[model samples]
Target: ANLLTSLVRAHLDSGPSTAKLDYSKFQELVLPHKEDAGDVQQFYDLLSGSLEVIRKWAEKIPGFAELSPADQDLLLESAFLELFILRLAYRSKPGEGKLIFCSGLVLHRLQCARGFGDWIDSILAFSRSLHSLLVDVPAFACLSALVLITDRHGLQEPRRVEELQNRIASCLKEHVAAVAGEPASCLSRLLGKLPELRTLCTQGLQRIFYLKLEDLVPPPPIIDKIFMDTLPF
Candidate 1:
């Protein structure tokens, strides 16, 4: 934390007076990177182990709530961009695990803020664009997971689950119908082979509702049944 503070301070001190300050450089440097597939898995493991670390630090952190509006904007911009890059970098290969880890972190922070709706819109825009470029199953799954999670947070306003469900089901059905009774193209063949895609989508919805239920209601045995029997299946 001290190192991060010093880095930010140095950048502010050295930046050109006439140039717009880019605080993103500070976050980019501070966040860890993965250059190898092994490192990617290790990164996911480390983040999983550090959930308590983040929770504890969040409790102790002083400036987030007290930050000026400008500072808050800077922090959100930098943090979101950092995670965005991480997601893109891991969109292929085994590094895909980072997607869920970073997405969850961003989701948690966004939920804690009063301006969550706007932040979620920004995130969804970025994720949608990223989805177009990355074709990996895990990456697609992560993006879908993000969508479902945001929806479950009541961020979709007038769009209810049934509406979104119909949209997704229609898209899936249309894709299948487009190639029905015809020789499958190479792309279609490749997509057909990914059995985990369906599972990942289901898991994503499950994760979102699991967190939502925990937030909306007290612990109960029925909640467990709701999760086990009803979510995503």
Candidate 2:
């Protein structure tokens, strides 16, 4: 408690000037490497690193340590891609329909025509819709937390995780309800968007797998691990 209390006061004292994670964690991230790698390996590398960042962030969620080590690892490995897509959409400039990679490359919709394949439209549609509703920082943070905290197929204590997830669900519900206009529909639709994010994550994996099979670029071990982990049997 002392260390954590000290930590928060330090962060609060420091404010938003906290140095952010950067391109070192992402060499040439997520389809933006048309210049350097010339293959989708960059995207895989990006996915691995981005997922690690999210995993680290998720691990710090209050009470997360109460979860079993196995359960935590299961959540990280299985839900990583979904969290990655959510993080991507959160940072995206959907008003302009720009796909913003963490590497600081902001590309217009047309620019993704090559890398995003035929699904750019669906990707941008989801991006625009999600951002338009939850612009508030805390609101999106709750939504993001839900992407990882939900039930997994195998867990040492499913009920415990479910209890925590239910709490977050209610938190998001209250946030939606607190809004001025009709929040009933907003909460319904926002919950509905989770399945859409899952679908988009699947399509992203397909794109990466196709690029790997084509052998246009050889992947590093980290990228290969991403491929192996992403594919479900």
Candidate 3:
């Protein structure tokens, strides 16, 4: 029925809320005040908005509900940092130093450089590489889902999650082919970006750890949860 691909396109289309007719309106709803980088409030505000976007998108994923609630939480928690960077890389026009959040709030690299530190440059570089691929929407959407539907350490239903991951991979491979001629090579390169993202994730953890020590502003509880959960210890 191509129902899987159809479902992917439908939910990932206009808005993470999944029913909004206009993506711009949804973006405006979550828009936060664009403040100076001296404070982390605005950065954390952007993080919260992006987290909600991923959560909504993940929930609508075709087989996502079949997993236990705890498994669902573990998967999303593990994948948040990668998905955050991935989404930003896709949305931002990095050639010009602009970093666009899921909320459609755009800020210059220098604006958030103090709060984000050197990590922002790494993100910009990653986005530049991503744009080079000219990845289409459907491919990016499936790739985002695959980023979350990964093999994390504590899943109760590893086999079930693997099945779902395989399903999504098939769709990605198929759609990549439909969009571009070389499905295998293209998918290989796309999936390779995940390892790069993992490195960036560690950089993010280090940034958050440093921010905690600086204590200029307290991170949101959800932000704390992600930082704590992502740790190996």
Candidate 4:
């Protein structure tokens, strides 16, 4: 359990520091765009930032770097949107329509609408629900790890990934009990968010495809990688 505690602590350290969030004037500076192009560009800019954060976060997961490069890519690529949504939801003030990006840039929901489209609404809806749960820090950390360590279908080492999955899953159980106390149902409610996350990811893919089809602005190459591999078709 010492290793598990350290794993959780490692993730805590790996998370972007929020100390600057309070002092940064980014919230006031970044406002809703007047045109669709500006909105899309801003949204894409934040997407690039979130992608980098997600990659670094994944690398810090205990067994993540030990996995083959291909497997690492598979997990991060498949789960980036989910991680993004989870991270954003936890950090944001959904009630105020404020989304806090990885770089501590804060923007209003109105500002994000043109570029994000319906996907933004779905994310906000999910954010509202997730926040209602009042999840604590450690439990949320385990939830983040669980999002990536899944038994994604194409893994070269499914068993090893699942082994990591089992460890994180149990750690979540311990965390939920320690903090929340009503272990079984609390755990169930937390895990239930995964399916919702998968749906949110689908919405994210659809939004990207729509953006590509419209050709209003090109997605970053990193965003393109997520779009290309996640297609169900």
> What tens digits encode model 1's per-residue C-alpha lDDT throughout 1-233?
33233323432232123234222312212223202333223323322333332223322223232434443333332222232323332331222211223222212322212222233333344445445544443323323322221222222232443343344334433444454566334345434423333333344334335444444322234323433443333
Candidate 2 versus truth, CA RMSD in Å, comes to 5.8
- Leading candidate by lDDT: 4
In model 2, what lDDT does residue 13 have?
30
Instruction: Give the alpha carbon lDDT tens digit for every residue of 1-233 in model 2.
Output: 33233323332232122244232432223443232343254455556556556666766666567799989877776677787777677677667766666544555665555555655677778888886776465556667777888887778899999987887777766766666465257677777888998898788777767677676666667546756765767
Every candidate's lDDT = 0.32, 0.64, 0.79, 0.81
Q: TM-scores, in order shown? A: 0.22, 0.75, 0.86, 0.90
Q: Which stretches of model 3 miss by more than 4 angstroms?
A: 1-38
What is candidate 4's lDDT per residue for 34-86, written digit by digit as tens? 23676678778888887767787777778889988999999999988898888
What lDDT tens digits, residue by residue, belong to model 3 across residues 15-110? 433232233422222224323444487678777888777887887888898899999999999999998999888877788877777665667777
Better of 3 and 4 by lDDT: 4
Candidate number with the higher lDDT (1 or 2): 2
Minimum summed lDDT over a 10-residue window in model 1 is located at 91-100
**Against the true structure, candidate 4 has what lDDT?**
0.81
Pairs that collide, model 2:
none
Where does candidate 1 clash, by residue pair? none
At residue 29, candidate 2 shows an lDDT of 30
RMSD in angstroms between candidate 1 and the native structure over all alpha carbons: 17.8
